[PDB]
């Protein structure tokens, strides 16, 4: 079961809508994730937009207790890969921004643009359990026009 490889964002849910709309820090268009267990690190490559233009990021996080990872980006983040199937990853992340506000978010990742409903239903359930309403879910594939 390998989690490392190409991963593209299809949907994101957030307890704070200010963090996921147009040009927001967490409207994240993932491209790949590499879990380096020997060195207890994780490598994340994704695009985001500022001023409506795509910008690329390559971050390095550190493995912590309970299969969680810490990474700095728009404040401090602690995330976990809550679910993994042969076709998807569901990530749960808690962000504390520079102003100190806390936000919980969820993201569904896949190998391309063709979503499997089985994975999507699990994403909606994880999102609900985290107290995030359905109306707070954004369709990221629909918004991802950044480079491959
Ligand atoms: C790829 O990023 C994400 N994917 C889903 C929800 N939130 C984020 C923010 C980080 C840094 C994990």
From Swiss-Prot:
Pfam families on file: Lipocalin (PF00061)
GO BP terms in the entry: sensory perception of smell
List the Gene Ontology MF annotations in alphabetical order.
odorant binding; small molecule binding
Which cysteines pair up through disulfides? They are 54-146
GO CC terms, sorted: extracellular space
For the keyword Membrane, the answer is no
Q: Which Gene3D superfamilies match?
A: 2.40.128.20
Main subcellular location of this protein, as a coarse class: secreted
InterPro entries attached here?
Calycin (IPR012674), Lipocalin (IPR002345), Lipocln_cytosolic_FA-bd_dom (IPR000566), OBP-like (IPR002448)
Subcellular location per the Swiss-Prot or TrEMBL entry: Secreted
| Alphabetically ordered keywords of this record | Disulfide bond, Olfaction, Pyrrolidone carboxylic acid, Secreted, Sensory transduction, Transport
* Keyword set includes Disulfide bond: yes
Give the function comment from the record.
Answer: This protein is found in nasal epithelium and it binds a wide variety of chemical odorants.
Q: How does it assemble?
A: Monomer.
Q: Which family does it belong to?
A: Belongs to the calycin superfamily. Lipocalin family.
Q: PANTHER family, from UniProt?
A: LIPOCALIN (PTHR11430), ODORANT-BINDING PROTEIN 1A-RELATED (PTHR11430:SF65)
Protein's name according to its UniProt entry: Odorant-binding protein
The organism encoding this protein is Sus scrofa (Pig)
What does UniProt list as this organism's lineage?
Eukaryota, Metazoa, Chordata, Craniata, Vertebrata
């Amino acid at each position: 079961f390998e989690l490392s490889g190409k991963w593209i964002t299809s949907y994101i849910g957030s307890s704070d809508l200010e963090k996921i709309g147009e040009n927001a820090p967490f409207q994240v268009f993932m491209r790949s994730i590499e879990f380096d267990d020997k060195e207890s690190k994780v490598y994340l490559n994704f695009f985001s937009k500022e001023n409506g233009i795509c910008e690329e990021f390559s971050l390095i996080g550190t493995k912590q207790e309970g299969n969680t990872y810490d990474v700095n980006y728009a404040g401090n983040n602690k995330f976990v890969v809550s679910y993994a199937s042969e076709t998807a990853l569901i990530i749960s992340n808690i962000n504390v921004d520079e102003e100190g506000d806390k936000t919980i978010m969820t993201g569904l990742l896949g190998k391309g643009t063709d979503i499997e409903d089985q994975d999507l239903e699990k994403f909606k359930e994880v999102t609900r359990e985290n107290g995030i309403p359905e109306e707070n879910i954004v369709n990221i594939i629909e918004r991802d026009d950044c480079p491959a």
